[PDB]
PDB file of all heavy atoms in Angstrom:
ATOM      1  N   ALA B  61      75.504  88.489  98.035  1.00  0.00           N
ATOM      2  CA  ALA B  61      74.777  88.235  99.214  1.00  0.00           C
ATOM      3  C   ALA B  61      75.055  89.297 100.284  1.00  0.00           C
ATOM      4  O   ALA B  61      74.118  89.697 101.014  1.00  0.00           O
ATOM      5  CB  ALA B  61      75.092  86.843  99.802  1.00  0.00           C
ATOM      6  N   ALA B  62      76.310  89.694 100.463  1.00  0.00           N
ATOM      7  CA  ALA B  62      76.659  90.778 101.411  1.00  0.00           C
ATOM      8  C   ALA B  62      75.917  92.062 100.962  1.00  0.00           C
ATOM      9  O   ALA B  62      75.372  92.789 101.807  1.00  0.00           O
ATOM     10  CB  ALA B  62      78.165  90.999 101.409  1.00  0.00           C
ATOM     11  N   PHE B  63      75.887  92.369  99.673  1.00  0.00           N
ATOM     12  CA  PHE B  63      75.183  93.525  99.179  1.00  0.00           C
ATOM     13  C   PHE B  63      73.673  93.441  99.455  1.00  0.00           C
ATOM     14  O   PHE B  63      73.074  94.419  99.875  1.00  0.00           O
ATOM     15  CB  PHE B  63      75.436  93.691  97.649  1.00  0.00           C
ATOM     16  CG  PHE B  63      74.762  94.889  97.064  1.00  0.00           C
ATOM     17  CD1 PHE B  63      75.272  96.179  97.233  1.00  0.00           C
ATOM     18  CD2 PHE B  63      73.607  94.734  96.322  1.00  0.00           C
ATOM     19  CE1 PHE B  63      74.651  97.266  96.707  1.00  0.00           C
ATOM     20  CE2 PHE B  63      72.985  95.869  95.745  1.00  0.00           C
ATOM     21  CZ  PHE B  63      73.551  97.102  95.963  1.00  0.00           C
ATOM     22  N   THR B  64      73.102  92.257  99.226  1.00  0.00           N
ATOM     23  CA  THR B  64      71.632  92.160  99.357  1.00  0.00           C
ATOM     24  C   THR B  64      71.220  92.232 100.841  1.00  0.00           C
ATOM     25  O   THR B  64      70.207  92.892 101.143  1.00  0.00           O
ATOM     26  CB  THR B  64      71.143  90.868  98.683  1.00  0.00           C
ATOM     27  OG1 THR B  64      69.855  91.159  98.083  1.00  0.00           O
ATOM     28  CG2 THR B  64      71.012  89.676  99.609  1.00  0.00           C
ATOM     29  N   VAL B  65      71.991  91.686 101.769  1.00  0.00           N
ATOM     30  CA  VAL B  65      71.664  91.780 103.175  1.00  0.00           C
ATOM     31  C   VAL B  65      71.934  93.241 103.654  1.00  0.00           C
ATOM     32  O   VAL B  65      71.157  93.793 104.458  1.00  0.00           O
ATOM     33  CB  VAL B  65      72.421  90.761 104.017  1.00  0.00           C
ATOM     34  CG1 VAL B  65      73.929  90.979 104.046  1.00  0.00           C
ATOM     35  CG2 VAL B  65      71.863  90.766 105.447  1.00  0.00           C
ATOM     36  N   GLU B  66      73.022  93.879 103.180  1.00  0.00           N
ATOM     37  CA  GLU B  66      73.254  95.268 103.497  1.00  0.00           C
ATOM     38  C   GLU B  66      72.186  96.195 103.006  1.00  0.00           C
ATOM     39  O   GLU B  66      71.886  97.216 103.648  1.00  0.00           O
ATOM     40  CB  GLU B  66      74.632  95.709 102.998  1.00  0.00           C
ATOM     41  CG  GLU B  66      75.214  96.913 103.689  1.00  0.00           C
ATOM     42  CD  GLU B  66      74.726  98.219 103.182  1.00  0.00           C
ATOM     43  OE1 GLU B  66      74.107  98.331 102.071  1.00  0.00           O
ATOM     44  OE2 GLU B  66      74.832  99.279 103.880  1.00  0.00           O
ATOM     45  N   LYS B  67      71.560  95.864 101.879  1.00  0.00           N
ATOM     46  CA  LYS B  67      70.424  96.615 101.377  1.00  0.00           C
ATOM     47  C   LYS B  67      69.160  96.317 102.142  1.00  0.00           C
ATOM     48  O   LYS B  67      68.293  97.196 102.389  1.00  0.00           O
ATOM     49  CB  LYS B  67      70.226  96.397  99.898  1.00  0.00           C
ATOM     50  CG  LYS B  67      69.039  97.105  99.180  1.00  0.00           C
ATOM     51  CD  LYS B  67      69.086  98.642  99.412  1.00  0.00           C
ATOM     52  CE  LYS B  67      70.294  99.298  98.859  1.00  0.00           C
ATOM     53  NZ  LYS B  67      70.231 100.776  98.881  1.00  0.00           N
ATOM     54  N   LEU B  68      69.034  95.061 102.612  1.00  0.00           N
ATOM     55  CA  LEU B  68      67.842  94.626 103.312  1.00  0.00           C
ATOM     56  C   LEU B  68      67.760  95.050 104.775  1.00  0.00           C
ATOM     57  O   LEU B  68      66.724  95.016 105.372  1.00  0.00           O
ATOM     58  CB  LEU B  68      67.737  93.077 103.230  1.00  0.00           C
ATOM     59  CG  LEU B  68      66.521  92.387 103.843  1.00  0.00           C
ATOM     60  CD1 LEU B  68      65.221  92.847 103.202  1.00  0.00           C
ATOM     61  CD2 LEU B  68      66.641  90.861 103.696  1.00  0.00           C
ATOM     62  N   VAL B  69      68.898  95.517 105.338  1.00  0.00           N
ATOM     63  CA  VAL B  69      68.880  96.022 106.739  1.00  0.00           C
ATOM     64  C   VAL B  69      67.946  97.210 106.901  1.00  0.00           C
ATOM     65  O   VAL B  69      67.491  97.458 108.039  1.00  0.00           O
ATOM     66  CB  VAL B  69      70.293  96.370 107.225  1.00  0.00           C
ATOM     67  CG1 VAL B  69      71.282  95.209 107.092  1.00  0.00           C
ATOM     68  CG2 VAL B  69      70.782  97.691 106.508  1.00  0.00           C
ATOM     69  N   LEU B  70      67.684  97.978 105.852  1.00  0.00           N
ATOM     70  CA  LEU B  70      66.802  99.101 105.971  1.00  0.00           C
ATOM     71  C   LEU B  70      65.383  98.731 106.385  1.00  0.00           C
ATOM     72  O   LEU B  70      64.659  99.530 106.943  1.00  0.00           O
ATOM     73  CB  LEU B  70      66.800  99.917 104.647  1.00  0.00           C
ATOM     74  CG  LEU B  70      66.007 101.243 104.570  1.00  0.00           C
ATOM     75  CD1 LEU B  70      66.563 102.279 105.562  1.00  0.00           C
ATOM     76  CD2 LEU B  70      66.008 101.772 103.168  1.00  0.00           C
ATOM     77  N   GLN B  71      64.937  97.478 106.037  1.00  0.00           N
ATOM     78  CA  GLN B  71      63.641  97.039 106.447  1.00  0.00           C
ATOM     79  C   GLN B  71      63.577  96.943 107.999  1.00  0.00           C
ATOM     80  O   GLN B  71      64.528  96.553 108.655  1.00  0.00           O
ATOM     81  CB  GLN B  71      63.371  95.676 105.838  1.00  0.00           C
ATOM     82  CG  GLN B  71      61.909  95.230 105.915  1.00  0.00           C
ATOM     83  CD  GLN B  71      60.978  96.044 105.042  1.00  0.00           C
ATOM     84  OE1 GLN B  71      61.425  96.909 104.270  1.00  0.00           O
ATOM     85  NE2 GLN B  71      59.678  95.779 105.093  1.00  0.00           N
ATOM     86  N   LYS B  72      62.404  97.295 108.519  1.00  0.00           N
ATOM     87  CA  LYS B  72      62.279  97.292 109.993  1.00  0.00           C
ATOM     88  C   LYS B  72      62.161  95.916 110.577  1.00  0.00           C
ATOM     89  O   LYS B  72      62.525  95.733 111.747  1.00  0.00           O
ATOM     90  CB  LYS B  72      60.992  98.129 110.357  1.00  0.00           C
ATOM     91  CG  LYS B  72      60.726  98.285 111.859  1.00  0.00           C
ATOM     92  CD  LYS B  72      61.929  98.842 112.678  1.00  0.00           C
ATOM     93  CE  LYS B  72      62.355 100.206 112.230  1.00  0.00           C
ATOM     94  NZ  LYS B  72      61.302 101.248 112.199  1.00  0.00           N
ATOM     95  N   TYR B  73      61.707  94.917 109.818  1.00  0.00           N
ATOM     96  CA  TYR B  73      61.536  93.581 110.368  1.00  0.00           C
ATOM     97  C   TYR B  73      62.837  92.954 110.757  1.00  0.00           C
ATOM     98  O   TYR B  73      62.912  92.308 111.837  1.00  0.00           O
ATOM     99  CB  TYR B  73      60.751  92.682 109.341  1.00  0.00           C
ATOM    100  CG  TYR B  73      60.477  91.330 109.836  1.00  0.00           C
ATOM    101  CD1 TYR B  73      59.369  91.062 110.662  1.00  0.00           C
ATOM    102  CD2 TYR B  73      61.262  90.265 109.499  1.00  0.00           C
ATOM    103  CE1 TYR B  73      59.111  89.791 111.099  1.00  0.00           C
ATOM    104  CE2 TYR B  73      60.990  88.940 109.945  1.00  0.00           C
ATOM    105  CZ  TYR B  73      59.890  88.753 110.759  1.00  0.00           C
ATOM    106  OH  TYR B  73      59.609  87.463 111.195  1.00  0.00           O
ATOM    107  N   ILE B  74      63.897  93.071 109.941  1.00  0.00           N
ATOM    108  CA  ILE B  74      65.156  92.459 110.170  1.00  0.00           C
ATOM    109  C   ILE B  74      65.895  93.314 111.254  1.00  0.00           C
ATOM    110  O   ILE B  74      65.793  94.566 111.205  1.00  0.00           O
ATOM    111  CB  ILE B  74      65.977  92.313 108.922  1.00  0.00           C
ATOM    112  CG1 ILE B  74      67.166  91.369 109.160  1.00  0.00           C
ATOM    113  CG2 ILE B  74      66.485  93.691 108.426  1.00  0.00           C
ATOM    114  CD1 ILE B  74      67.972  91.085 107.866  1.00  0.00           C
ATOM    115  N   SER B  75      66.618  92.668 112.148  1.00  0.00           N
ATOM    116  CA  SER B  75      67.311  93.309 113.245  1.00  0.00           C
ATOM    117  C   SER B  75      68.834  93.265 113.076  1.00  0.00           C
ATOM    118  O   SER B  75      69.342  92.807 112.041  1.00  0.00           O
ATOM    119  CB  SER B  75      66.863  92.656 114.557  1.00  0.00           C
ATOM    120  OG  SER B  75      67.419  93.332 115.690  1.00  0.00           O
ATOM    121  N   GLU B  76      69.554  93.721 114.099  1.00  0.00           N
ATOM    122  CA  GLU B  76      71.003  93.713 114.029  1.00  0.00           C
ATOM    123  C   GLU B  76      71.631  92.341 114.177  1.00  0.00           C
ATOM    124  O   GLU B  76      72.422  91.907 113.329  1.00  0.00           O
ATOM    125  CB  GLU B  76      71.571  94.697 115.094  1.00  0.00           C
ATOM    126  CG  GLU B  76      71.539  96.164 114.654  1.00  0.00           C
ATOM    127  CD  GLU B  76      70.148  96.741 114.555  1.00  0.00           C
ATOM    128  OE1 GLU B  76      69.138  95.987 114.838  1.00  0.00           O
ATOM    129  OE2 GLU B  76      70.033  97.952 114.225  1.00  0.00           O
ATOM    130  N   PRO B  77      71.403  91.562 115.306  1.00  0.00           N
ATOM    131  CA  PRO B  77      72.121  90.303 115.479  1.00  0.00           C
ATOM    132  C   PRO B  77      71.819  89.251 114.405  1.00  0.00           C
ATOM    133  O   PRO B  77      72.701  88.434 114.122  1.00  0.00           O
ATOM    134  CB  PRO B  77      71.699  89.843 116.866  1.00  0.00           C
ATOM    135  CG  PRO B  77      70.405  90.528 117.133  1.00  0.00           C
ATOM    136  CD  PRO B  77      70.492  91.836 116.433  1.00  0.00           C
ATOM    137  N   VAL B  78      70.628  89.257 113.840  1.00  0.00           N
ATOM    138  CA  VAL B  78      70.359  88.355 112.700  1.00  0.00           C
ATOM    139  C   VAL B  78      71.224  88.747 111.518  1.00  0.00           C
ATOM    140  O   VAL B  78      71.761  87.828 110.843  1.00  0.00           O
ATOM    141  CB  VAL B  78      68.862  88.337 112.362  1.00  0.00           C
ATOM    142  CG1 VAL B  78      68.374  89.707 111.836  1.00  0.00           C
ATOM    143  CG2 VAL B  78      68.551  87.236 111.344  1.00  0.00           C
ATOM    144  N   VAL B  79      71.448  90.008 111.268  1.00  0.00           N
ATOM    145  CA  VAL B  79      72.313  90.434 110.175  1.00  0.00           C
ATOM    146  C   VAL B  79      73.754  90.086 110.457  1.00  0.00           C
ATOM    147  O   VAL B  79      74.507  89.649 109.572  1.00  0.00           O
ATOM    148  CB  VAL B  79      72.173  91.974 109.943  1.00  0.00           C
ATOM    149  CG1 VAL B  79      73.252  92.481 109.023  1.00  0.00           C
ATOM    150  CG2 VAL B  79      70.800  92.273 109.339  1.00  0.00           C
ATOM    151  N   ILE B  80      74.168  90.179 111.726  1.00  0.00           N
ATOM    152  CA  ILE B  80      75.512  89.786 112.149  1.00  0.00           C
ATOM    153  C   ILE B  80      75.709  88.296 111.912  1.00  0.00           C
ATOM    154  O   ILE B  80      76.775  87.836 111.389  1.00  0.00           O
ATOM    155  CB  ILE B  80      75.815  90.236 113.599  1.00  0.00           C
ATOM    156  CG1 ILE B  80      75.888  91.761 113.692  1.00  0.00           C
ATOM    157  CG2 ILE B  80      77.141  89.594 114.085  1.00  0.00           C
ATOM    158  CD1 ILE B  80      75.739  92.286 115.089  1.00  0.00           C
ATOM    159  N   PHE B  81      74.725  87.484 112.302  1.00  0.00           N
ATOM    160  CA  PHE B  81      74.838  86.050 112.098  1.00  0.00           C
ATOM    161  C   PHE B  81      74.859  85.698 110.610  1.00  0.00           C
ATOM    162  O   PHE B  81      75.561  84.808 110.170  1.00  0.00           O
ATOM    163  CB  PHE B  81      73.641  85.332 112.754  1.00  0.00           C
ATOM    164  CG  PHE B  81      73.707  83.859 112.683  1.00  0.00           C
ATOM    165  CD1 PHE B  81      74.492  83.105 113.516  1.00  0.00           C
ATOM    166  CD2 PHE B  81      72.940  83.163 111.734  1.00  0.00           C
ATOM    167  CE1 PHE B  81      74.545  81.753 113.434  1.00  0.00           C
ATOM    168  CE2 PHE B  81      72.971  81.771 111.623  1.00  0.00           C
ATOM    169  CZ  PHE B  81      73.770  81.061 112.490  1.00  0.00           C
ATOM    170  N   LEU B  82      74.072  86.428 109.791  1.00  0.00           N
ATOM    171  CA  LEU B  82      74.062  86.192 108.346  1.00  0.00           C
ATOM    172  C   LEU B  82      75.417  86.550 107.753  1.00  0.00           C
ATOM    173  O   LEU B  82      75.960  85.790 106.919  1.00  0.00           O
ATOM    174  CB  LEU B  82      72.981  87.021 107.652  1.00  0.00           C
ATOM    175  CG  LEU B  82      71.547  86.561 107.855  1.00  0.00           C
ATOM    176  CD1 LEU B  82      70.588  87.649 107.429  1.00  0.00           C
ATOM    177  CD2 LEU B  82      71.296  85.266 107.082  1.00  0.00           C
ATOM    178  N   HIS B  83      76.035  87.671 108.201  1.00  0.00           N
ATOM    179  CA  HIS B  83      77.389  87.970 107.712  1.00  0.00           C
ATOM    180  C   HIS B  83      78.409  86.930 108.141  1.00  0.00           C
ATOM    181  O   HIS B  83      79.297  86.549 107.353  1.00  0.00           O
ATOM    182  CB  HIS B  83      77.815  89.349 108.207  1.00  0.00           C
ATOM    183  CG  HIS B  83      77.219  90.500 107.390  1.00  0.00           C
ATOM    184  ND1 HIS B  83      76.199  91.259 107.783  1.00  0.00           N
ATOM    185  CD2 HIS B  83      77.645  90.967 106.183  1.00  0.00           C
ATOM    186  CE1 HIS B  83      75.921  92.168 106.860  1.00  0.00           C
ATOM    187  NE2 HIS B  83      76.800  92.013 105.839  1.00  0.00           N
ATOM    188  N   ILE B  84      78.270  86.444 109.396  1.00  0.00           N
ATOM    189  CA  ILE B  84      79.272  85.433 109.860  1.00  0.00           C
ATOM    190  C   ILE B  84      79.129  84.140 109.112  1.00  0.00           C
ATOM    191  O   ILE B  84      80.156  83.622 108.710  1.00  0.00           O
ATOM    192  CB  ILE B  84      79.034  85.242 111.408  1.00  0.00           C
ATOM    193  CG1 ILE B  84      79.495  86.463 112.202  1.00  0.00           C
ATOM    194  CG2 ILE B  84      79.710  83.968 111.924  1.00  0.00           C
ATOM    195  CD1 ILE B  84      80.993  86.596 112.403  1.00  0.00           C
ATOM    196  N   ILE B  85      77.926  83.689 108.859  1.00  0.00           N
ATOM    197  CA  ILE B  85      77.763  82.398 108.154  1.00  0.00           C
ATOM    198  C   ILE B  85      78.114  82.564 106.672  1.00  0.00           C
ATOM    199  O   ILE B  85      78.651  81.613 106.092  1.00  0.00           O
ATOM    200  CB  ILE B  85      76.368  81.844 108.370  1.00  0.00           C
ATOM    201  CG1 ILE B  85      76.341  80.320 108.178  1.00  0.00           C
ATOM    202  CG2 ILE B  85      75.298  82.465 107.473  1.00  0.00           C
ATOM    203  CD1 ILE B  85      76.843  79.529 109.365  1.00  0.00           C
ATOM    204  N   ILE B  86      77.842  83.693 106.091  1.00  0.00           N
ATOM    205  CA  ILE B  86      78.233  83.956 104.685  1.00  0.00           C
ATOM    206  C   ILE B  86      79.761  83.975 104.570  1.00  0.00           C
ATOM    207  O   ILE B  86      80.307  83.387 103.646  1.00  0.00           O
ATOM    208  CB  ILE B  86      77.635  85.281 104.170  1.00  0.00           C
ATOM    209  CG1 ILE B  86      76.114  85.111 103.964  1.00  0.00           C
ATOM    210  CG2 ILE B  86      78.299  85.758 102.917  1.00  0.00           C
ATOM    211  CD1 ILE B  86      75.704  84.411 102.647  1.00  0.00           C
ATOM    212  N   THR B  87      80.456  84.588 105.485  1.00  0.00           N
ATOM    213  CA  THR B  87      81.912  84.570 105.509  1.00  0.00           C
ATOM    214  C   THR B  87      82.458  83.180 105.745  1.00  0.00           C
ATOM    215  O   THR B  87      83.451  82.776 105.156  1.00  0.00           O
ATOM    216  CB  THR B  87      82.464  85.600 106.529  1.00  0.00           C
ATOM    217  OG1 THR B  87      81.874  85.319 107.751  1.00  0.00           O
ATOM    218  CG2 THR B  87      82.241  87.009 106.080  1.00  0.00           C
ATOM    219  N   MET B  88      81.790  82.420 106.654  1.00  0.00           N
ATOM    220  CA  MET B  88      82.260  81.040 106.928  1.00  0.00           C
ATOM    221  C   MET B  88      82.131  80.160 105.701  1.00  0.00           C
ATOM    222  O   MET B  88      83.030  79.380 105.354  1.00  0.00           O
ATOM    223  CB  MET B  88      81.487  80.518 108.112  1.00  0.00           C
ATOM    224  CG  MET B  88      82.060  79.178 108.637  1.00  0.00           C
ATOM    225  SD  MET B  88      81.416  77.695 107.909  1.00  0.00           S
ATOM    226  CE  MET B  88      79.690  77.707 108.518  1.00  0.00           C
ATOM    227  N   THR B  89      81.005  80.213 105.004  1.00  0.00           N
ATOM    228  CA  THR B  89      80.776  79.441 103.789  1.00  0.00           C
ATOM    229  C   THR B  89      81.738  79.871 102.702  1.00  0.00           C
ATOM    230  O   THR B  89      82.188  79.000 101.893  1.00  0.00           O
ATOM    231  CB  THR B  89      79.317  79.520 103.340  1.00  0.00           C
ATOM    232  OG1 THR B  89      78.467  79.126 104.373  1.00  0.00           O
ATOM    233  CG2 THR B  89      79.088  78.655 102.068  1.00  0.00           C
ATOM    234  N   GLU B  90      82.043  81.184 102.586  1.00  0.00           N
ATOM    235  CA  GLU B  90      82.886  81.686 101.516  1.00  0.00           C
ATOM    236  C   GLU B  90      84.320  81.121 101.681  1.00  0.00           C
ATOM    237  O   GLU B  90      85.046  81.018 100.666  1.00  0.00           O
ATOM    238  CB  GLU B  90      82.909  83.194 101.574  1.00  0.00           C
ATOM    239  CG  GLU B  90      83.698  83.860 100.415  1.00  0.00           C
ATOM    240  CD  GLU B  90      85.142  84.149 100.739  1.00  0.00           C
ATOM    241  OE1 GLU B  90      85.431  84.687 101.866  1.00  0.00           O
ATOM    242  OE2 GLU B  90      86.040  83.838  99.903  1.00  0.00           O
ATOM    243  N   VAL B  91      84.756  80.802 102.915  1.00  0.00           N
ATOM    244  CA  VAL B  91      86.040  80.134 103.119  1.00  0.00           C
ATOM    245  C   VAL B  91      85.959  78.628 103.111  1.00  0.00           C
ATOM    246  O   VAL B  91      86.939  77.967 102.733  1.00  0.00           O
ATOM    247  CB  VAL B  91      86.742  80.659 104.428  1.00  0.00           C
ATOM    248  CG1 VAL B  91      85.845  80.363 105.685  1.00  0.00           C
ATOM    249  CG2 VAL B  91      88.128  80.025 104.574  1.00  0.00           C
ATOM    250  N   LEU B  92      84.834  78.080 103.488  1.00  0.00           N
ATOM    251  CA  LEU B  92      84.619  76.618 103.486  1.00  0.00           C
ATOM    252  C   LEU B  92      84.478  76.000 102.111  1.00  0.00           C
ATOM    253  O   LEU B  92      85.114  74.962 101.824  1.00  0.00           O
ATOM    254  CB  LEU B  92      83.397  76.254 104.359  1.00  0.00           C
ATOM    255  CG  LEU B  92      83.160  74.758 104.607  1.00  0.00           C
ATOM    256  CD1 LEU B  92      84.253  74.169 105.468  1.00  0.00           C
ATOM    257  CD2 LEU B  92      81.815  74.592 105.346  1.00  0.00           C
ATOM    258  N   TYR B  93      83.728  76.613 101.243  1.00  0.00           N
ATOM    259  CA  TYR B  93      83.450  76.025  99.907  1.00  0.00           C
ATOM    260  C   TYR B  93      84.669  75.944  99.026  1.00  0.00           C
ATOM    261  O   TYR B  93      84.932  74.897  98.385  1.00  0.00           O
ATOM    262  CB  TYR B  93      82.298  76.806  99.198  1.00  0.00           C
ATOM    263  CG  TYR B  93      82.336  76.702  97.706  1.00  0.00           C
ATOM    264  CD1 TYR B  93      81.877  75.547  97.091  1.00  0.00           C
ATOM    265  CD2 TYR B  93      82.792  77.745  96.864  1.00  0.00           C
ATOM    266  CE1 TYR B  93      81.831  75.424  95.711  1.00  0.00           C
ATOM    267  CE2 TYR B  93      82.752  77.645  95.501  1.00  0.00           C
ATOM    268  CZ  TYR B  93      82.304  76.473  94.920  1.00  0.00           C
ATOM    269  OH  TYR B  93      82.287  76.320  93.553  1.00  0.00           O
TER     270      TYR B  93
END
Side-chain angles (χ1 to χ4, degrees):
Chain B
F63 181 77
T64 215
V65 66
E66 200 279 341
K67 180 54 60 172
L68 184 58
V69 304
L70 185 62
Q71 194 70 4
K72 181 55 59 56
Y73 183 81
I74 195 176
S75 185
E76 279 70 359
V78 64
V79 168
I80 291 162
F81 183 80
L82 287 166
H83 278 103
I84 289 282
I85 204 80
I86 288 281
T87 50
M88 191 271 291
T89 304
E90 186 267 313
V91 59
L92 188 63
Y93 157 76

